[PDB]
């Protein structure tokens, strides 16, 4: 299965390198490009199964680093949604117990929780407004 290591290890090595980088990072842009791929096949967490997969094999200190950046991507409305979707793939592919443990977690987790709640209120309000369409039509 050496060919398999070669094909699969590509994006793994790519992302991992991104996370190692404490630079602003095209990590955002890698995720972003891969979560809105105009062809969403197959139907799963990121649309590219490979992304769920490399998400699963994740190094734990790097899971932490990923959250540390995620909380930063939640401050801007623009970068927010992609953050929400990787957060979603992350939480769905990992049971809570591995995640409860550490490898300073709670403060980051609370920034995440707070800002996620904010955008929740925002989007709900937008559904309420969005019904305007429903009336205008009929």
């Amino acid at each position: 299965t050496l060919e398999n290591y070669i094909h699969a290890g590509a994006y793994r090595d790519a992302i991992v390198l991104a996370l190692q980088l404490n630079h602003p990072g095209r990590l955002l842009n890698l995720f972003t490009n891969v979560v809105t791929t105009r062809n969403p096949d197959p139907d799963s967490l990121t649309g590219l199964k490979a992304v769920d997969d490399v998400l699963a094999k994740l190094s734990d200190e790097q899971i932490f680093q990923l959250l540390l950046r995620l909380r930063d991507w939640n401050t801007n409305a623009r970068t927010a949604p992609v953050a929400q979707r990787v957060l979603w793939a992350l939480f769905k592919s990992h049971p809570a117990n591995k995640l409860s443990s550490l490898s300073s977690l709670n403060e980051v987790l609370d920034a995440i929780k707070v800002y996620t709640e904010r955008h929740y209120k925002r989007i709900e309000e937008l559904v309420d407004e969005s019904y305007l369409v429903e009336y205008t039509l009929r």
Binding site: L105, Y120, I123, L126, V127, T136, L137
Partner: protein, 163 residues
């Protein structure tokens, strides 16, 4: 006085952007229907601006010029448009929904449009059809991005309880 210079400027940018984008969409669907006749030999020849930009989809050229306008001027600028532009706009709005491109923005602008064009939109069956499209897609988009944060906030509450 000056407000109308702003408004007018921000009007022309969206109007012509929408012209280019709409023509582009129409050529590509033409090429679609043309290739489904004979798959071999059929070039797109798109407007040079897109290929100049790094060969981008119409949707995003439109979306960008939009996203670029000042929040405040966005209102009067929307209002100042000729109606001839409107259907195209809905056709793009649909697309913004279909790919979940900047939902709160595509919303805000969609409301601004509907608030000022009720009767006009509900008149022509074509515009109403595109409006049903954006209805569906924008509703589906909001749904998904809602449920996502819900699950997210459930898991966050559960690990916060677990700690």
């Amino acid at each position: 006085t000056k407000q109308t210079v702003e408004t007018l400027m921000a009007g022309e940018r969206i109007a012509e952007a929408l012209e280019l984008g709409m023509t582009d969409l129409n050529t590509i669907r033409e090429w679609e229907e043309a290739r489904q006749i004979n798959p071999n030999i059929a070039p797109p020849q798109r407007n040079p601006i897109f290929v100049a930009l790094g060969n981008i989809p119409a949707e995003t050229y439109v979306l960008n010029t939009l996203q670029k306008i000042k929040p405040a001027s966005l209102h009067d600028a929307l209002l100042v448009l000729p109606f001839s532009t409107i259907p195209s706009l809905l056709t793009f709005l649909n697309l913004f929904a279909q790919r979940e491109l900047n939902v709160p923005l595509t919303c805000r602008i969609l409301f601004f449009v509907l608030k000022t064009h009720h009767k006009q939109i509900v008149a022509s069956r074509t515009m109403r059809a595109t409006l049903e499209k954006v209805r569906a897609n924008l509703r589906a988009a909001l749904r998904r991005q809602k449920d996502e944060m819900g699950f997210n906030i459930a898991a966050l509450k559960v690990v916060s309880m677990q700690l």
